[PDB]
Amino acid sequence: RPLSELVERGWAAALEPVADQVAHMGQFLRAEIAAGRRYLPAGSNVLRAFTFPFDNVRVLIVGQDPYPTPGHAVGLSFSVAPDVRPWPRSLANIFDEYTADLGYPLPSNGDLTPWAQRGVLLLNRVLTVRPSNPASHRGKGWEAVTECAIRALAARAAPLVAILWGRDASTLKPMLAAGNCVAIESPHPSPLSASRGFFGSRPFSRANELLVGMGAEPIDWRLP
Ligand SMILES: O=c1[nH]cc(F)c(=O)[nH]1
Numbered sequence: 001r002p003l004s005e006l007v008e009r010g011w012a013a014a015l016e017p018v019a020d021q022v023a024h025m026g027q028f029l030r031a032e033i034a035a036g037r038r039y040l041p042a043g044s045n046v047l048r049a050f051t052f053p054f055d056n057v058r059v060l061i062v063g064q065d066p067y068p069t070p071g072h073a074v075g076l077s078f079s080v081a082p083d084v085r086p087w088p089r090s091l092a093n094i095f096d097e098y099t100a101d102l103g104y105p106l107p108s109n110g111d112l113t114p115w116a117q118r119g120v121l122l123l124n125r126v127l128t129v130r131p132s133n134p135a136s137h138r139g140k141g142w143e144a145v146t147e148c149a150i151r152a153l154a155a156r157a158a159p160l161v162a163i164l165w166g167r168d169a170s171t172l173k174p175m176l177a178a179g180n181c182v183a184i185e186s187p188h189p190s191p192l193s194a195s196r197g198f199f200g201s202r203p204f205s206r207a208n209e210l211l212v213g214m215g216a217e218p219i220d221w222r223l224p
């Protein structure tokens, strides 16, 4: 399939250099199913972050790998469907930092689509996972795809702030070395890393200050 059937057109053009790799991934995923190994999120959600316009991305959030529990991952990093409770621990931790930083009430639900509609790309370094097996698709080929995505964003040379959560930060910063790009890092919001530096990192206000510094408009982070 042409990438234009799977992703928004700006993203299809940006990712055309890795189109074969995306096709390779689809073959991998189908072979996993044939071998009895499922993946998450749903196939139609794998590339969901790339269905919001490439040309509108102002903030890139980059996590590690999708939630491994069935019913959680939706193809926007960290997000869940609006009916999901309890929220996953990483998301609950994100929302505590959100209230600490911004002073807003806790969100009504775990659905981050408003951020995606507002120019926040909710990416992961690796775009699939086998259920119950954290990080199990590492090294399977997503990395080249997400490197192309990140570099293509950087190459726009439009104001961009990248928020890097977790162990990929040192790998990803060189990909964001470009005019009008700034990368800020912390430990990941997961259960056993959040209290080692995620909390207190204030990414939402920081990203807005960095955007304004560059002459861009800040993100309205307010969730319903
Ligand atoms: O690194 C991540 N952890 C948890 C998630 F839900 C996600 O998308 N990314």
Ligand SMILES: [Cl-]
Pocket: 088, 089, 090, 091, 190, 191
């Ligand atoms: Cl989690």
